[PDB]
Design an enzyme around this catalytic site. Structure first.
Site, mmCIF file in Angstrom:
data_model
loop_
_atom_site.group_PDB
_atom_site.id
_atom_site.type_symbol
_atom_site.label_atom_id
_atom_site.label_comp_id
_atom_site.label_asym_id
_atom_site.label_seq_id
_atom_site.Cartn_x
_atom_site.Cartn_y
_atom_site.Cartn_z
ATOM 1 C CG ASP A 180 -2.164 0.911 1.012
ATOM 2 O OD1 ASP A 180 -2.313 1.510 -0.087
ATOM 3 O OD2 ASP A 180 -3.007 0.990 1.944
ATOM 4 C CB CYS A 214 -5.640 -1.854 -4.119
ATOM 5 S SG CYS A 214 -5.946 -0.139 -4.643
ATOM 6 N NE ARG A 220 -2.093 -1.271 -2.958
ATOM 7 C CZ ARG A 220 -2.334 -1.972 -1.846
ATOM 8 N NH1 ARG A 220 -1.531 -2.978 -1.499
ATOM 9 N NH2 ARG A 220 -3.373 -1.671 -1.076
ATOM 10 C CB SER A 221 -6.715 0.250 -8.553
ATOM 11 O OG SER A 221 -7.008 -0.747 -7.560
ATOM 12 C CD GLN A 261 -3.754 6.239 -2.338
ATOM 13 O OE1 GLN A 261 -3.228 5.125 -2.164
ATOM 14 N NE2 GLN A 261 -4.576 6.795 -1.449
#
Ligand code: VO4
Length: 297
Positions: A180, A214, A220-221, A261
């Site tokens: 993450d 995710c 991550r997506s 992110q």
């Protein structure tokens, strides 16, 4: 050339300013449905909501809300559904969406437990002999087989609509070593996983959009989808210089907020696309090199 943009960004150490530029240019659309008090328990993160214009609607009458967005990349000709990690009360919603949207593949980029906390429900059966039944949405789900690799696992699931008794095969691609707010170990191991998803047929136009999640469904997506669309666009002509990775990201955030992110995830995306260009531009041998470099056994 994104290779020159990349070198120029690295040399001036401008990844964080560039990343903040995208964040400030990013689309800002209403999320009125997501914020209705009745939908509180359907959102995992207060600050991560699907836009109203692109949200996936459940084909049910009680409440059609799910934290999921359709990313429609017209020029690339690819669609994705990005969603959050299902909550204990939304696992039936999640599978209903999979059924109704006719997806063939689900890409899971997170672990159930990460950083000491529960980031996602255990929404698929871990044991062949213990199927799951989602009684709110009348769906049955059975683990048919698993192919466990060192850093990802592929599962074959059977999804049954208990109303019509139609069954569908679902491929589950579970990436288990992507932290993450972090990046994959290597371009090679990310690309190897991406191409194993591609080789499965899950991204064919004969199927509904692949589901990508995710925990929040954005970081991550977002990295996964951005790199994929960029490689497809470069595939369409055979013109790397044609692909503006930052503009592709912004186009994607028209459909879902916060895609990618951190600045290192943006920098990783460039690396993945640059490395992936070797295969798109004629060197198929690079696929086996990724696989070897990935140590998947
Ligand atoms: O579960 V994610 O924080 O990579 O959107």
């Amino acid at each position: 050339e994104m290779e020159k943009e990349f070198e120029q960004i690295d040399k001036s150490g401008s990844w964080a300013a560039i990343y903040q530029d995208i964040r400030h240019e990013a689309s800002d659309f209403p999320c009125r449905v997501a914020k209705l008090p009745k939908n509180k328990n359907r959102n995992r993160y207060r600050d991560v909501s699907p836009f109203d214009h692109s949200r996936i609607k459940l084909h049910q009458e009680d409440n059609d809300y799910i934290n999921a967005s359709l990313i429609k990349m017209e020029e690339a000709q690819r669609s994705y559904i990005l969603t959050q990690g299902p909550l204990p009360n939304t696992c039936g919603h999640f599978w209903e969406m999979v059924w109704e949207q006719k997806s063939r593949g689900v890409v899971m980029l997170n672990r159930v437990m990460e950083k000491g906390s529960l980031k996602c429900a255990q929404y698929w059966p871990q044991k062949e002999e213990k199927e799951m039944i989602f009684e709110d949405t009348n769906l049955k789900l059975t683990l048919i087989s698993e192919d466990i690799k060192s850093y990802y696992t592929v599962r074959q699931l059977e999804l049954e609509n208990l109303t019509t008794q139609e069954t569908r095969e679902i491929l589950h691609f579970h990436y288990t070593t992507w932290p993450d707010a972090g990046v994959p170990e290597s371009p090679a191991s990310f690309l190897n996983f991406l191409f194993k998803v591609r080789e499965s047929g899950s991204l064919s136009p004969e199927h509904g959009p692949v589901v990508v999640h995710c925990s929040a469904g954005i970081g991550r997506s977002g990295t996964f989808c951005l790199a994929d669309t960029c490689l497809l666009l470069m595939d369409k002509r055979k013109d790397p210089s044609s692909v503006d990775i930052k503009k592709v990201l912004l186009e994607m955030r028209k459909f879902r907020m916060g895609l990618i992110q951190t600045a290192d995830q943006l920098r990783f995306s460039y690396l993945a696309v640059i490395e992936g260009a070797k295969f798109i531009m004629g060197d198929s041998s690079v696929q086996d090199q990724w696989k070897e470099l990935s140590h998947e056994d």
